[PDB]
Amino acid sequence: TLTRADWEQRAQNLKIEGRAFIQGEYTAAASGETFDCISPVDGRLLAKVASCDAADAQRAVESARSAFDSGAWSRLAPAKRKATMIRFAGLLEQNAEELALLETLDMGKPISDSLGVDIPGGARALSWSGEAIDKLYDEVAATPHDQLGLVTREPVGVVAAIVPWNFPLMMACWKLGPALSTGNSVVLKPSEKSPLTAIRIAQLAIEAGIPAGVLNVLPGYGHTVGKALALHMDVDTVVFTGSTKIAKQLMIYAGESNMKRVWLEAGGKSPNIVFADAPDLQAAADSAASAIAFNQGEVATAGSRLLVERSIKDRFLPMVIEALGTWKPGNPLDPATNVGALVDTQQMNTVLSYIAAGHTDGARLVAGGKQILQETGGTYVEPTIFDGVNNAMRIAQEEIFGPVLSVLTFDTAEEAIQIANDTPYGLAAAVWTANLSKAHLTARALRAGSVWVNQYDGGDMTAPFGGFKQSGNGRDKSLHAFDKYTELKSTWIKL
Amino acid sequence: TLTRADWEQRAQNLKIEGRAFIQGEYTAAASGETFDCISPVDGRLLAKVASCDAADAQRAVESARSAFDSGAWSRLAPAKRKATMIRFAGLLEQNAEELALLETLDMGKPISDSLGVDIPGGARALSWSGEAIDKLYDEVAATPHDQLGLVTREPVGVVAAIVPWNFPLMMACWKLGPALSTGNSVVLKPSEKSPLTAIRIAQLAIEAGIPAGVLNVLPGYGHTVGKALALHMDVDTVVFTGSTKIAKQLMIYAGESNMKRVWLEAGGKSPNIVFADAPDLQAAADSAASAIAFNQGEVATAGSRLLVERSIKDRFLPMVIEALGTWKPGNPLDPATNVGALVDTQQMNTVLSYIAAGHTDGARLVAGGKQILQETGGTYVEPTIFDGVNNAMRIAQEEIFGPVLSVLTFDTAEEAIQIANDTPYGLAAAVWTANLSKAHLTARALRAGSVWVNQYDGGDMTAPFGGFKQSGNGRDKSLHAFDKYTELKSTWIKL
């Protein structure tokens, strides 16, 4: 296992690709323009990254359409797409240390998180979706003796995948795993905040046997190359993870253009509900802390509203505070670090503005509240807890996307449910109770795509993942993620 | 069987409800405004129908939300919803002769059509959907021993259904069936061109045991109450059948509103591909004629592009022409009538303007081509055929929505596919051939939601129905229709 010094040497010794990837080749943007990729770790210049626009989009869509029409991947045998997808995942694992290090330098998460959560997680999404292609079965209808009716699925065609920066490789693999498996071509627009891992893996896909043009990568700004894709006339489906504001704008784009399919995964204000009869109080405290502190609160499913029953609130809130103190911001290149940098100064000041709004709304600060380690030139905020929060307050309604917990109270399960669902979101939620009926009945009433019971951030590749309401449409991971990339056909045959 | 005279008297003795239906009662629009419901049969004024606006949408959606939250329907046991759903169908079949009379009078299709296709059709969508409720199963994932991972479906909440006028009852039941069966509340916006059946079955649902507020009906204009419903912020899902141009608009409204779910059934330019080696040319010719004549050619899955292998086109065309002669417009209240009125003056002049375009385009008119029965006080076009159409032509590329055939020819099976897929649409297509290989391979390359082989207008309630590309997203009929009215939840339980 590598020391801190070991990692800082590796970061020095990287040659970092910054070019786009189109038709099996790395390429500049047609303008030749670039944008600067700056690390949140120290502030250094990682690379000069190609800044793509509509022309670069049009080139990539033509490469996607061409490759798809050729059938070189979309009609390649399903046992062979399995093999190739599994090889693709293993090449992520082969160069895990390079890819993890790129992910830490690019958006600022702890190297030990990247090495042990992100890169394994993205490979997992690829290899699992690969294992599943030939385990899937389409349907025959019950038809009269002179009819045979097939209901089959086929690749939609060309998929645009616009992903965010909080889990750059993992989120993109969550889109690529199912989309690439079902035979589609994918044009992949990573975040401007985190272009480095999507850029590197394009060569890795080619080397695994993905045919040229089946996976092109277009780094650049959302309002440029991203808009262009969402607005393109030859793009069939767009998949997306990011701000509820942009997801909504994507829908408009689709209706303004070719009426493409739009699948969104937007934000969340996920309630974490601890009941007085929780089986292990310490586990819930540890989990409540981990729910807001992990990946410096830049998590869509962050447990950002802690919902406690009064009977235990006085005993519980110190337990949470003590757990949350084990989560200390640090040098993201240090393997012992578990809280990293916020992605950029912009993210840092939104977080600090919300903390202020916590005071202004009337809540009470009980831990954190400050930016630390500014001597580094990095951007870090200590995890922060607010108490006496009321669900109408700005820090209970609006997604903060930082390590900032709100704590509310309730007396009955009917109340807890009502407060948990008093949000435009529905991405995740948690229930802690040892009572069988209360456990299941509360899971039913929670309008959230993911409901964890006696644990937080649960699920593996078998669990679908996505939101209710303004939190998204569709589900990533699992067999259901495939449905966003396929189209049902009814072949009815007279005999 | 009832005679012409019989229906003429029955029509005269109908008493027609025109009101909207909210919270278990008939009602006016808040404004008190109405619009004249005019029958294309002879100008007869059927009734003065409520002209609802945004104020009424808000009343209805408030009603829906209360009903849904109360659980009277949404948490009523599956098997009980099933029985209710089947009774609902039963009441359609009980009032079949009135409902069919309303259909024919409001939008001008033949009464024998209405009695024999629409009412049984919409009834079955209600009953088959109810039959399947308790036959469904949600999933249990392969988890480690200390986990229980449930993957379940829940109703989204309140569903807005905006439905077209070509099949007023049945198109609505395609939505009501699954949407009501999954336990949602529905606000149903019928066509201003055809409100009568939707208005009517509202009472019928109450009587079947549907609770007040679970199904509310709002007659009125697309650009008033229809646009308000898709812009409403407490409407979780919108489902829509109709024009591609308006379907695009709903995607935009959703983006502008609450990021609600948007399922679209839109336009169509479906190809009918007849190979020389087709088993029965007579059968292919009668069905080619039926494919464009039935329901006045106002069918989204109409076979408006007839693609013929040149090697038989000199022989096949007269068989199509002669077959089409048996489809003759007449009194829609005559049981003998197989072609009815067009829906209004507006619709007739689109059809007539496109026939004019055909001559402009360079096409040869070989059958029909005129407006008929001007004496009636009603709107009628003869089934019309254009020969020598080139796929780039206007009457080939654009949907006409009347009895207008475009006849194209092809030298290879590959040419047949290029031409078939050379459209922004993908609702349906058909393939006539007795070759086992040619049939299935051609079916695969057709980017259409429904592919009929050696038949036209194939499938029953077990076959999904919907488009590729700009013809829509999602499927009506079958078990897949249920997906557009539910939301997936992953309940991961640590043990």
Added chain:
Amino acid sequence: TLTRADWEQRAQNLKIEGRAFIQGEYTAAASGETFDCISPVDGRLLAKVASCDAADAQRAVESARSAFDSGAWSRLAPAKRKATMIRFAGLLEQNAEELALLETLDMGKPISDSLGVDIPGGARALSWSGEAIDKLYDEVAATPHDQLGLVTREPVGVVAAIVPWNFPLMMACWKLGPALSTGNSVVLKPSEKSPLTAIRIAQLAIEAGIPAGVLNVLPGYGHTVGKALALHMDVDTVVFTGSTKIAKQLMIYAGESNMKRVWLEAGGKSPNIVFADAPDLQAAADSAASAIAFNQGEVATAGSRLLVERSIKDRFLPMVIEALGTWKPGNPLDPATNVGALVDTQQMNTVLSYIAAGHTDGARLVAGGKQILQETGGTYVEPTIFDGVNNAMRIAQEEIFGPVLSVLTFDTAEEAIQIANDTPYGLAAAVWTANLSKAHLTARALRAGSVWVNQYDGGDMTAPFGGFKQSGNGRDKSLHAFDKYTELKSTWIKL
């Protein structure tokens, strides 16, 4: 509601068919032999029932094969079979009062039982099975592009169903429902102890539109016509509910015959596990009493082993005892009667001999324990409880098939499972506890086909039913029941 007097007259005025049913007509056995059908209510002679033998099996199976091969049923469209199947159910509900009277008179269960459980129960198995026919889908495999791989189901052919006497109509419908719905032909051998309902619904099926020969009924003895059917070489599948000792025999016959398929529903010694922390002790006590009293304890899923946490056994037992007092044998033709006659003199002396064994075994009798109502001319045992039973005891290990409770105690949840799984059986079990973890983990370790939690006699038509180990193979009810009446075919088509 009909009165005691009412049923007494109705019974007296019944005219009872006793004949067998082959090829659409009632008939005698070839021999002309009959056997006396004697009512356990008072010795009354209901009718002289056809005593069929191998000659009749061959006639019936010849009939079945012709019907099946003709296709009148086996290749009739799914949706048409569905309607027929539902009408069949309809005719059971139409003649519910006669059918129930027959059930109660033939095998001596309370008329309120028959009217309210058996007839609706068997009716629903017929209707729910018919409802699901067209809701099923067969599969399409992920193949290379030049292949089409269908995976479909077809009816096996002619099914022999030999059914027990504890639930004569419903147990038969559990087989008829799916077996008829998948389109097989059935030869149904009711119990010699209870032929009347099976004989009767044969007419009813003809009238529902079941073709002649598709359902044939052969009353008679297990060791004559029953053994012949399972030994017959044109019978593709045999399905059987009844004794473990006879179920073993059918496996042997199949080996000796045509290697036909053998699906078994057999014996039971199901455990009822009551933890101290159960939510409602009253609810657990009433249901423990119901679990052994209902239907005279002649239930395979009867809760004959009541496993109690010692920490509540001194408190819980009187609640079970007192509850059991409300179950009192009486006139089975009295609507007030909740415990009926035992099925015959033979059955009564097994129950009485096992009660004697209980005293021999070392158990303490705390309730009941006697034969009752000797004056009636009929066979009755009081619901009986033994306390201090050790799991090795005879009355613990062997099925008694009467109202006889054995009460055991346990110190740990692990002990509760050891004792529960310490039996050759695995039909059912239940677990009372309010702990979320204890409930689900205990449910997993119970090697039983049905596990009921915080309730007894759980499930509806959607839940599979059948044993682990020597209680059987395969499942009745749900969609899985259909698997025992179909055969899978892989049609791989090269293109």
Added chain:
Amino acid sequence: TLTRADWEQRAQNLKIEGRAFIQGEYTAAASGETFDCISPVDGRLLAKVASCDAADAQRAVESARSAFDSGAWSRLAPAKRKATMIRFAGLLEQNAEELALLETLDMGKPISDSLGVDIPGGARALSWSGEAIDKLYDEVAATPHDQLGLVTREPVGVVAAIVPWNFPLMMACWKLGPALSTGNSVVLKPSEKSPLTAIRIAQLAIEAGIPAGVLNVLPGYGHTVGKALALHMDVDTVVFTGSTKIAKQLMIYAGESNMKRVWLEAGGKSPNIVFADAPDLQAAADSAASAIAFNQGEVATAGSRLLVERSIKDRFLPMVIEALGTWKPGNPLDPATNVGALVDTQQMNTVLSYIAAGHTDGARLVAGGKQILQETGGTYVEPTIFDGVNNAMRIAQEEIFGPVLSVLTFDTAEEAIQIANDTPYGLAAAVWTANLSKAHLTARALRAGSVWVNQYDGGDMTAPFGGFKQSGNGRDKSLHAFDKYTELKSTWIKL
């Protein structure tokens, strides 16, 4: 690629294990007895193989029961059983040349068949079933709001797998892949004719991470160790592939003992039906030859009745004869050989007795008929064709299990169907036609588990495989094979 001399050197240099494997260790039979393993290639002594009996069975079942109860594999996480199963398959591929060579020396098939069909095929069955564990989902019922009903599958417990000698490693992997995946313990009784590969892989499983006792291997005679397993009281399910005679006797064993589950895969007389409109006549001829010649006719799905339409029979039968001549018996250690030895002299003389019976029945010999290469001390029979065969004849009814083709005629498809189904078997069948309707309609009418169209021996791991009628119960390969190793449980929970 290895030469013939290269392989004969390797066969000299093998140390060959002949011991049983029980509880992670190789072990003698409790008697110390052995039997001689003699190669059909030259006649040499391969090893002295442990001859197991009931005591060795009892030891192995205790090891299986113990390992299963410990949960060390049956409750190990499904993603980890996937990993282990895939590692197990890769160790087959790592030592493919040793394992293929053992398979060729032990039962006499061509080394190039073993290396390229058998060993890849068995690894494929293991790795595929491994990939599929966490792609499988159990079910939640549609239940009232106060009920949650799970339908889950669990490992049956202890599985006995008795496999034949025609594909020793592949057939055993077809049982092991699904049985080991679902968590069961497997006791594996290979053929006495082919013990070597099952013996070797036991170490390979241990080395892949299969826990000790989860896979024990018991070589020895069917009437000894095999009978004992089938008769054992603590064996839950028996799976089997072999003679219809023994399969039937296994059923008797199960009923004589513990009423265990019995899954059988017995013989076949598979019709290969070539129609005059077959798309490629030469392909059908080549396939018809390959259908009987491949693996020297020792194939259950061997195309042993060629069904030809008269119109082409005179043109077709020479084409088959010419193809069949390219299939020449040879030294099984030669890589160019494609027909090997019959397994033993006993097999050789059954084949020769049937060839004689061909003449006696009245058929006419047109190719082969003789034993050749006796100078070798090996046992070889040249592929043989009989013409003018009638379905009543002994070589058209009785399975030969040699390279012996029967050829019959027909004039209509109704006739062909009738002759194809005029058999007690139903394992496979083939249809050759370019006509769409005839292709599908004939596949429907064929009572066979596998129906190939325009190809023979089709299917991959996605296609189930098993028989109708006396040809077996259940299906190997695909997701359905898992059902023989699991048990359904209905967990119904009141809330």
